[PDB]
C-alpha cells in the first residue's frame, strides 16, 4: 500500500463511522483525502487533524448531495483543491428512516434514492473525466470504490425496502462501468457491511458480534490501492462476520 | 394450472411483448386480465378479442405510470372493473432511451427510474391491500410476478446502465417484500428474460438465438398459479437460452 | 404440459420422496416413468399402480448407483424397456449420514460423493447418447433435471458439509454440460428444494413451514416440458418458502 | 499487515505459479513459509532462496495430496518443522487433462476430485486443531485460504466440468466450514481467479489480459492478515480483470 502516498482520494460521507474510519486509515500511509459531510454535525478540525496525525493530509467539504448540484459542487471544490481524484469513494447513504411498503409515498422514495442512488450516479459522472485523467497520467488505474452492503444481497429489515434495493441498484450499475469504463483504467469495486456498530441479530452471525469501523476500513484500502487490487475489478467483498456467505 | 380459472390478474405494459404473450396464456385457463398500454399505440378490441378467443376474458386500461398517480388510476380502475386481485404482474419497463454515464442528466436517470421503479413500487403498494384480501377469501396465495432482467445480473449494455440498475433494484425489493407480506400469504417471484425479439449476441447464447415471447409466458404462468408455485417465493426464474446461469 | 404424454423420463431415487411425488404428478400427463429404488424398501406394483391410474405408465428398478456399474445397469434397463429416453431426473441422494470435519474419513467422504457427484454424473453420462438421439427425432429439447438443494448455496447444518458441497457440485457441472450439450438440444435445470418432509427451522422459513413433496413436483414437470421450459436450461428455481432467496 | 512476520504459513502447490508468488509476497512481511510441491520439477534452494531474500523463512516439502495419507504426512512434516500452523492455503488443484463428459471414466473423475476435493478436504482437516490452537494462543483468528476459480461460477471450458465442480464444491464447502469452525476462530475465505498466465478468451476480458501471478497474491496476504481480514469470513474475492463480476 505505500503507493497510496499522496494519491487524492474523495469520500463522500466520511465526518463518521465507516468513511471516516476509511480516510484515516488510508491516511496512514499518506493520502490525501476529501472529507465530506452532509448535514450530521462535525468538526472539521479535529477529523483533519486525525488525518494529519495519521500522516496524511485532507479538507472537509460540506453537500447534501442528495441534491445533483450539490454533487457537482462537492466534486468541484476537491478537484480545485487538489487539482483532481485518484480514488472516489462513495460512501454516503443510509435508510431515511424506515417505512412499510403501505406508508412509502413519493417523498419517501425519493429521499432514499437521491441519497443512496442519484448521489452515486452523480458523484461518479462528475468524476469519471478526473479519473480517466489521473490513470491516463500514472499509467496504471485509478479507482471507484462505494459501500454496499448485505440488504443489497437478501431483502434488508422490514422498512428497510427501498434502502436495501438501492444497494442492489448500486452493486449492479458497477458492473455496468465496468463496461463503458476499463477502456479508461478505471476499476470500480465493491464493500458490503453486514451489521457495524440486536442480540438477536448476533445470533444470526457466525463470530456473533456487530463489526467495528475499524474492521471495515481495510477492505477500502485494498481496493484503493492498484497495487494490491490492480488485476481486480467488477467485485464485491462483503465485510460481515459470516452473516451472509454469497 | 386449472387453478386459474376466473383469477384476476393485472398485467402492466401488456398491450404488446411479453406482457400480452402472457395474457393470451392465462387466458387459455380462463384468466381474466387486465391488460394495460402506457405510451404505445394498440388496439383493445383485437387484443381483448384474442383474450376470448382463448378462452378468458378481460378489459384495457390506459396509463403513463411513471407517474404515481397514473400507477394509482390504474389499480383503481382494474378493481372497480373486476371487484379486487389474485395476481399483479409487474412488466411495464424498458430502456427509456440509452446514455453513456457523463452524459445523464435527473431527467434520464429519473425517466429510467420512474419508468422502471416507481412503477413497480406504486403499482405493487396499490395492490397489497386486494391481493391480502383475495388470499384471505381463498385461503391459499395470491401472486406478484415481476419482469427482471439479465441486466440486473451482470450490468447491462453500454448506455443501458440505469436500467441494468433498476432491474437489481427490482429483484433485491422482492426479496424485502417476501418478509414484510408472506405473513399475508403473498408470493413474489420473478420471471428474467435474456434476448427477447444481433448475429453475435447470439454468439453468447448456448441456444444460438433471441428467444420469443411465446417462450416467455409460461413461466409467468407457473408463478402464477398456488397449484404449481404455492411454496416458491422470493425466486427468479431466467429464461435465456443458457446466456447466463446463475 | 399435454406434450407430456407418452415421454420416457427415467427419475433416480424415486421409489419414495420428491422423486415419486413427480414420477405421479408426471404420470397425469401420460407420462411413461421409470422409477427407481437403491436401499429403500418399496412396493413396485404399488408404485406403478399408482402411475397407471394417474393415467401413466412405468417399470421400477433396482441399483445401488453409489457405484458406476449400478449406473450403467440402471440405464441400460430402462432403455431395453422403453428403447429410449426423453427425461432424465437425477433425484438420488442425500445426508448418507452426518460427521463433522474432523471425524470425515476416506469412506465417509466417498460414500457421501458418490451417492451424489458419482451417481449423478456417470447417471447423466451413460444418458447423453439416447437424450441427444430423442432429440434429433423430436426436432425440439429433451431435459436433464436434477435435484440441487438449498445446501448447494449457503453450506448446509453442520456434518453435512460433503453434502452440501455435492450439491453445488451439481449446480455448476450443469453450468458446463450446457456448454457441451446445448449444441445437442438437451437442456438441463436443477430443482433446489430446502426444507422438505425443526420449530425453530421453521422459524427460518418465511412461509413458516416444511414444504411438502407434493409442492416439490410441479416445478420438475415445469422443466420436463419443452412447451413450458424450451428456451430454459442452465437454471435452477429453488422451492423452500422463502427460506432462501437468491 | 505487520502481523504477518512470524506467521506460518503452508501452501499447498506453492513450488511455482499463484502459490509461489503468494509465498514470496507473505515473506516480504516476514512470514514463514512451507512451500510443497506434488510432481513438478522444482528447485528448493531456488525457492526457499527467494523467500528468504524477500525477508521470511521457510521449507520445502514434497507430497502427492491425491492421496489422503500425503495430505496427513505434508501436515506433519510442516508442523513438526515449525510447531503449528497459523495460516493454510489450500492451492493444489488444476485440470488434470480435459474430457468430454461421455469419455469420463472412474479413473478421471477420482483423479480430478482427488486432486481438487479429497485434497482440500483432507489437508484441512488435519489443520484444524492446530489452527484452533493458534487462534486461541494469540486470541485473534487463524485461518484458511483456498485457491477457487471463476470456473465455480459458470461451469468452466469445455472437456473442464469436474474440474469446475470441484471448484465449486470448495466455495460451498467453506460456508459450511464457517458454521463449523467459527467458534474456534478460525476464518475461511477464497480467492478465485480467472485467467492467469487466447486472444479470443481475451475479448471477453474488461482489461483486456490475462493476470499475472503478481497480481493474485496480494489478495492471499489480504486474507491472511487478522488486521486486514479479522471480521471477513466466508468470502471469495474473484481475481479476474473483470471476466466475471458477481
Not at 422498512?159 to 458497477?174: C, N, Q, R, T
Not at 463503458?180 to 458480534?209: C, L, Q
Request: charged residues 20%.
Amino acid at each position: 500500500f505505500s503507493d497510496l502516498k499522496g494519491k487524492r482520494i474523495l469520500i463522500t460521507g466520511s465526518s463518521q463511522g465507516i468513511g471516516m474510519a476509511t480516510a484515516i486509515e488510508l491516511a496512514r500511509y499518506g493520502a490525501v483525502v476529501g472529507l465530506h459531510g452532509r448535514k450530521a454535525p462535525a468538526d472539521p478540525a479535529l477529523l483533519l487533524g486525525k488525518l494529519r496525525e495519521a500522516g496524511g493530509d485532507g479538507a472537509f467539504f460540506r453537500a447534501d448531495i442528495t441534491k445533483t448540484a450539490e454533487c457537482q459542487r462537492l466534486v468541484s471544490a476537491f478537484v480545485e483543491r487538489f487539482d483532481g481524484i485518484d480514488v472516489l469513494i462513495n460512501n454516503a447513504g443510509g435508510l431515511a428512516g424506515r417505512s412499510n411498503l403501505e406508508n412509502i409515498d413519493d417523498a419517501f422514495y425519493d429521499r432514499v434514492m437521491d441519497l443512496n442512488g442519484r448521489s452515486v450516479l452523480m458523484m461518479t459522472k462528475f468524476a469519471i473525466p478526473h479519473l480517466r485523467a489521473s490513470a491516463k497520467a500514472s499509467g496504471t488505474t485509478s479507482a471507484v470504490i462505494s459501500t454496499g452492503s448485505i440488504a443489497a444481497r437478501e431483502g434488508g429489515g422490514i422498512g428497510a425496502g427501498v434502502y436495501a434495493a438501492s444497494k442492489a441498484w448500486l452493486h449492479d450499475i458497477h458492473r455496468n462501468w465496468v463496461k463503458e469504463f476499463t477502456k479508461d483504467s478505471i476499476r470500480f469495486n465493491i464493500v458490503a457491511p453486514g451489521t457495524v456498530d440486536k442480540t438477536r441479530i448476533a445470533n444470526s452471525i457466525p463470530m456473533g458480534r456487530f463489526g467495528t469501523v475499524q474492521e471495515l476500513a481495510p477492505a477500502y484500502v485494498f481496493f484503493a490501492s492498484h497495487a494490491a487490487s490492480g488485476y481486480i475489478t467488477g467485485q464485491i467483498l462483503d465485510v460481515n462476520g459470516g452473516q451472509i456467505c454469497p
